[PDB]
Structures are given as C-alpha cells and as structure tokens.
Amino acid sequence: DPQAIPTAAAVQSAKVVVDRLLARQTAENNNQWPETIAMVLWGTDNIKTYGESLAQVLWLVGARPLPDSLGRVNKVELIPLEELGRPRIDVVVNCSGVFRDLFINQMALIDRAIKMAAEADEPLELNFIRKHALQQASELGIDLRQAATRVFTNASGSYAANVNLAVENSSWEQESELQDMYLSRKSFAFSAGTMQQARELFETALKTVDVTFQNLDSSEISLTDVSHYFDSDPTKLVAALRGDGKQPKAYIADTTTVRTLSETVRLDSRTKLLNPKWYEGMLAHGYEGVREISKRLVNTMGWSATAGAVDNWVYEEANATFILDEQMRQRLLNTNPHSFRKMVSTFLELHGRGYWETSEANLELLRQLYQEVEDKIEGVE
Numbered sequence: 001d002p003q004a005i006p007t008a009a010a011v012q013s014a015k016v017v018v019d020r021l022l023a024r025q026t027a028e029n030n031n032q033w034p035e036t037i038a039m040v041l042w043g044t045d046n047i048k049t050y051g052e053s054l055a056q057v058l059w060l061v062g063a064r065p066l067p068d069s070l071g072r073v074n075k076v077e078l079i080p081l082e083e084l085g086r087p088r089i090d091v092v093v094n095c096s097g098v099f100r101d102l103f104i105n106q107m108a109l110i111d112r113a114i115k116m117a118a119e120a121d122e123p124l125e126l127n128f129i130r131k132h133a134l135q136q137a138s139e140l141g142i143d144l145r146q147a148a149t150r151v152f153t154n155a156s157g158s159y160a161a162n163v164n165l166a167v168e169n170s171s172w173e174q175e176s177e178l179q180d181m182y183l184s185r186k187s188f189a190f191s192a193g194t195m196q197q198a199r200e201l202f203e204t205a206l207k208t209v210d211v212t213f214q215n216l217d218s219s220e221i222s223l224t225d226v227s228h229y230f231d232s233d234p235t236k237l238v239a240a241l242r243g244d245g246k247q248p249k250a251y252i253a254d255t256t257t258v259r260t261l262s263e264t265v266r267l268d269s270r271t272k273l274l275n276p277k278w279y280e281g282m283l284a285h286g287y288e289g290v291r292e293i294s295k296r297l298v299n300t301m302g303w304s305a306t307a308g309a310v311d312n313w314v315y316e317e318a319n320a321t322f323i324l325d326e327q328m329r330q331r332l333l334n335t336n337p338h339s340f341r342k343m344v345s346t347f348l349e350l351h352g353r354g355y356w357e358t359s360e361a362n363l364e365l366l367r368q369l370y371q372e373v374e375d376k377i378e379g380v381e
C-alpha cells in the first residue's frame with residue numbers, strides 16, 4: 001500500500017542511520033558536512049521496512065512526512081533549520097526500476113520535498129540543495145525547480161546499469177565504458193507517466209557528490225551474494241566526472257540488526273569467499289558449489305571496478321586458498337572444470353586490470369593452469 005510509507009517507526013529508525021552516517025563523515029573529514037550524498041532506493045527493502053531508506057532521504061533534505069487520518073502520506077513539509085540542527089544535505093536519489101514500478105507516488109513526494117528545500121529562504125551554508133540548485137540554474141540556463149531535479153531511475157520499462165552484465169561478460173577495456181553505461185541508463189528523471197532523459201543534469205548533480213551510500217542486510221543478501229549492489233555503485237563514476245577527480249567516501253548501512261564500503265567488503269570476504277565454513281558449505285553441493293565460488297570472485301571484482309573497494313590482500317588470499325593449495329585446486333578442477341576455468345580467468349583478469357598485484361610465479365602458474373583445464377575441457381568435448 002504505497003501511501004502507507006513511511007511509517008513513524010520507519011521515520012524514527014531512519015533518523016538514527018542518517019545521524020550515524022553524517023557523524024562518521026564529519027568526524028573523518030575535518031568536521032566538514034558532505035554537500036551531496038548519492039544513494040540507491042531499492043523497492044523490495046522499502047516494502048519490508050515500511051519506507052526506511054525513503055525516510056532517510058527525507059531526513060537528509062530536512063523533510064518530514066504527514067500521515068492523514070487513513071495513514072496515507074500524501075504531503076511533506078520542511079523541518080525548520082533550528083529543528084534540523086545541521087544543513088539540508090543535497091541527495092542524488094537513484095531509484096531502482098522496481099522502486100519506480102511500485103512507488104511513482106513516493107518518487108513524486110521526494111521530488112516535492114527537494115524542490116521545497118531549494119526554494120526555501122535560508123542561508124546557503126545550511127541548505128546545500130539551494131546552494132547547488134542556484135549554481136546549477138545559472139550554469140545550465142534553466143529554472144531553480146528544474147535545476148532541483150534529484151529523483152533518477154531507469155527508462156520506463158528498463159532495469160539496472162548493465163555494469164553487472166559488463167563485469168560478468170568481461171566485455172570492457174576501460175572503467176570509462178562501465179561509467180558511460182551507467183550514465184546512459186540511470187539518467188531518467190521523475191517530473192510532474194514518463195521518465196524524461198536528463199543526462200546533463202544527472203552528470204551536473206553527480207559532480208557535487210561527496211558521499212555514496214546504500215542500505216543492505218548482509219545477513220540476507222550480502223554485498224557479494226549478487227551483482228546488483230556494485231551495478232548501482234557510482235563511487236568511481238563521481239571521481240571520473242568531477243573536475244577535481246575526488247572519489248567520494250562510500251558507506252553501507254548493514255540492516256542485519258553504518259560502515260565504509262571498504263570495511264563492508266573486508267567483513268564479507270572473510271565471512272564468505274575466504275571463510276572455510278562458507279566455501280566447504282558450497283562444495284557440499286558439488287558442481288553448483290564451484291559455480292557459487294566463481295560467482296563470489298566475479299562480484300568481488302565488480303566492487304574493484306565500481307569503487308576500488310577491494311584490498312589486494314583479498315585477491316592474494318583467494319589465490320592462496322583456491323589455486324596455490326594443490327589439494328583444493330584439484331577438488332575445484334575435478335568437481336567443475338568449467339567454473340574452475342572461469343576462476344582461473346578471473347584471477348588473470350584481475351591482474352590484467354591492475355586490481356590484483358601478485359608474483360610472476362603466481363601468474364605463470366595461473367596461465368599454466370588455464371592451458372591445462374582448456375586441454376581437459378576439450379578432452380571430453
């Protein structure tokens with residue numbers, strides 16, 4: 001029931017997460033407030049939380065919902081700056097296609113809130129939406145309301161950046177290509193039927209991003225269980241667009257019960273890809289199990305592609321665990337030659353793309369093993 005969202009419980013849960021996100025960012029970077037946060041809104045998650053990440057967006061821009069009598073959220077108002085107790089933070093609101101499919105009315109609500117923030121008569125140092133929208137209105141020669149466009153998604157009918165697909169298929173040379181794919185697919189703006197492409201305004205707003213942010217429940221679907229999270233990650237994109245080339249700080253709120261993306265990748269890697277409990281658990285399935293391990297390594301590479309969030313030691317440990325250990329290598333090779341070949345390919349690709357630095361010895365062995373499994377695959381075929 002899309003008008004039910006967000007509930008007073010979701011509003012209250014969301015305040016805690018946003019205060020924690022801003023506290024970490026200020027404490028780390030010279031007590032500087034971030035100007036703009038790029039964040040993803042997943043539709044399934046907004047069902048389950050009665051609109052927690054929705055409410056996080058409203059909190060950031062200093063808006064509160066207004067349930068009528070039938071518990072419908074039809075309107076917003078601004079929190080006054082003395083109540084907010086900090087600047088209005090600008091937000092690039094990257095809605096999933098599914099969020100768009102289910103919550104067009106709530107995409108309209110966010111939009112009203114941000115335009116409201118933009119038009120407010122308040123000092124620019126306490127209203128980063130207003131500060132940006134005026135600069136943006138001036139640069140591009142448009143209205144302030146037009147300039148205060150922040151609610152973006154896929155084209156009507158479409159899903160995903162297809163950065164996941166690029167990584168899974170190894171069908172790309174430079175990061176610019178992944179970044180071009182994202183900007184070409186995610187630049188469709190909500191406005192008062194049709195998502196209008198607005199690429200130049202999407203790029204302009206993206207260049208103002210200081211922080212990237214997503215909510216995830218690592219207990220249910222971790223950062224590396226699926227490709228959809230790195231698919232939606234604009235961390236390296238923002239660096240590549242910005243005049244100053246500054247990569248924004250990246251965070252993940254884990255809703256299991258706020259970390260840097262780096263911290264979250266390290267936790268997931270030691271819990272899943274590098275953890276004996278996990279990979280032995282997968283190999284118990286046999287043929288499918290080796291596929292799951294290969295998939296994990298590909299999704300980890302995805303985070304290298306979008307964020308450079310994977311420490312070299314993660315790839316060195318994965319190589320030591322699955323390739324250098326002759327016993328484990330033989331089990332992979334014997335159970336699933338096809339997924340073993342993919343894993344060997346993925347280790348060589350990671351070196352090829354500069355995401356993994358390793359010894360000549362390790363690479364020679366990977367090439368040697370690449371030859372041997374192909375020779376075996378063609379053996380039966």
Ligand SMILES: [K+]
Nearest residue numbers: 096097159160
């Ligand atoms: K999507």
